[PDB]
Ligand binder design. Structure first.
Ligand SMILES: Cc1cc2nc3c(=O)[nH]c(=O)nc-3n(C[C@H](O)[C@H](O)[C@H](O)COP(=O)(O)O)c2cc1C
Ligand SMILES: Cc1cc2nc3c(=O)[nH]c(=O)nc-3n(C[C@H](O)[C@H](O)[C@H](O)COP(=O)(O)O)c2cc1C
Lengths: 321, 321
């Protein structure tokens, strides 16, 4: 769970709070009492490592003065928290039979606990924690796996997608932010065969692959549904884009292809789906489980099995001036 | 890894391929030989259990006929694959000195191996696999955690965000899809202090909170950078929204607040950053680690850890007609 708001004094008499957890990874190590052999070893061993993108914080029920002495005598280079009242000891549930059970936690940049060790054995502990931290940082500070995996796949199974799954795609989309929280996005989820077959007639030849999709999501909006600000800053389609971005990530996580297209007759599709004529039908999203690439044109099959194609980063981003 | 393309015959003599793994979760259990005591028990126990949203597939080097008999004798309700040539036995690496090691795999809807058991002990195995599958399905088929956690947070620390982390936000954005792969999005990442101060003067007072951000990302595009199709379907801002949507997910995973705004003077900011006059500056994204909400206005403070505010789903989605 997330670490609650709190305030504790450090070995330096300073106030350490939840805010001091934010923006860093934290190794939080609970020890029973400053000065003992095992706890001295643990603190010294944590102190002598160099943790990439993390801080080390020791915590016990000791007094500030005791912790200060503990640090001074061992030349410790970590923060120590005095928790005489056991506020965090209780929150992390490290007390048993009234005594502290040596325990260690990894906390992320939002303050969420990501890993724990209970009934810690000091021998080998720091190295195990170090290795777990490196793995956690590798996981979080690398490209999101769903963003990376999402492709404009065109091979779709005909198997029906359960409505509860389709609905989750919409729920995720709806959690996008928007100007003034206008939420300008609108969706028509189509999973009725007869309706689908009518929409198929409004598709160009190159979108034959959409005909396998057991579901299509029509995404529409209207300018006055959102902010329209100076210098041509109309937000309705941008914000709807934020929503569809979420939708594709959610689909990819769920093992669904969600492929937004522009290839269709908008007037016909709006007519079929009874979408107001003054709305923009900005995309039609084909949704389905992954199917059989051998049904695709050679061109589409090659796009599908080939690597991502993008401009060099320098063509789309500049740093300062 | 992802499962190779293959075709094998089932106990019914039907062809089963990797396409038959797609769109389902699969428990694939290898056993050395049909009819032995342990393998009989394993198959019987898998068949008796219920696995929601998954299929159970046994596989050995036995003939189709031997598998048919094995199924009939034990009233098995699973698919069995005949693999005399050891095509999947080799791929899954279950052969030790040419002999099959009892092994089981969980494969997701994309065909990725998500969990494995090797040198399997039959007793308790089916239950262990059920629990692991249930957990797998729980995570994949629930709301994406980063989408769920992303909020328009306004308390930002002044702490520098390393360029390697800022680079990753842009990389994730650039992996968005776009009409004709046009990639219409453009970014100026600002982290130089004096440049940030100039931008601050073009912000309205109500966006005071942005002035603590150590980085601002200016997002701009132009209509002719993307598809412009009939019925008022201009794609440049929609597609840029897809990109920013990815950016926000990536930031959230990394423990960064990424908060897109519309409160700024676009002409002033474009001038400061040398963005061409005919571009639309559609958002400024404040990026930073989470800071102290106590520094926010009373209204913003209440919002900082408030519940999500959205329209009811029925207001933004319709099913079919
Ligand atoms: C708004 C939009 C419309 C698209 N329209 C089509 C389409 O009509 N037909 C099609 O085969 N692909 C279409 N695509 C898919 C793109 O061609 C694809 O995203 C792009 O080539 C990049 O490939 P990638 O997403 O796998 O990285 C569309 C994508 C977007 C964002
Ligand atoms: C395009 C856009 C512009 C926004 N502009 C501002 C802004 O100028 N100032 C601000 O305090 N919040 C702004 N927001 C944040 C929204 O108000 C916020 O996303 C909305 O209230 C919903 O909150 P949530 O994202 O936490 O769910 C903007 C959001 C978007 C998508």
């Amino acid at each position: 769970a997330r670490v609650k708001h709190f305030e504790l004094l450090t070995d330096e008499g300073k106030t350490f709070t939840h805010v001091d957890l934010y923006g860093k990874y934290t190794i939080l190590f609970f020890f029973p009492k400053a000065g003992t052999s095992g706890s001295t070893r643990e603190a010294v061993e944590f102190s002598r490592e160099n943790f990439e993108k993390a801080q080390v914080v020791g915590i016990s029920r000791d007094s500030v003065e005791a912790l200060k002495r503990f640090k001074e005598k061992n030349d410790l280079k970590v923060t120590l928290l005095s928790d005489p009242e056991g506020i965090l000891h209780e929150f992390f549930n490290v007390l048993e039979n009234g005594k502290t059970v040596r325990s260690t936690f990894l906390i992320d940049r939002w303050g969420f606990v990501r890993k724990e060790w209970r009934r810690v054995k000091v021998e080998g502990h720091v190295q195990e924690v170090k290795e777990a931290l490196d793995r956690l940082i590798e996981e979080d500070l690398s490209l999101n796996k769903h963003i990376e995996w999402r492709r404009a796949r065109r091979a779709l199974k005909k198997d029906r997608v359960p409505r509860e799954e389709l609905e989750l795609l919409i729920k995720a989309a709806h959690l996008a932010p928007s100007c003034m929280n206008n939420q300008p996005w609108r969706f028509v989820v189509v999973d009725e065969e007869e309706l689908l077959k009518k929409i198929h007639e409004a598709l160009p030849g190159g979108n034959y692959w959409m005909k396998n999709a057991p579901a299509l999501i029509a995404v529409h909006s209207k300018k006055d549904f959102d902010c329209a600000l100076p210098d041509n800053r109309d937000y309705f389609l941008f914000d709807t884009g934020l929503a569809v971005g979420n939708l594709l990530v959610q689909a990819t996580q769920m093992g669904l292809v969600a492929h937004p297209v522009a290839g269709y007759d908008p007037v016909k599709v709006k007519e079929i789906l009874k979408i107001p004529e003054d709305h923009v039908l900005i995309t039609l999203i084909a949704v389905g489980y992954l199917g059989d690439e051998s049904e695709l044109s050679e061109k589409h099959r090659e796009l599908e099995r080939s690597e991502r194609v993008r401009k060099e980063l320098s063509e789309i981003v500049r740093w300062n001036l």
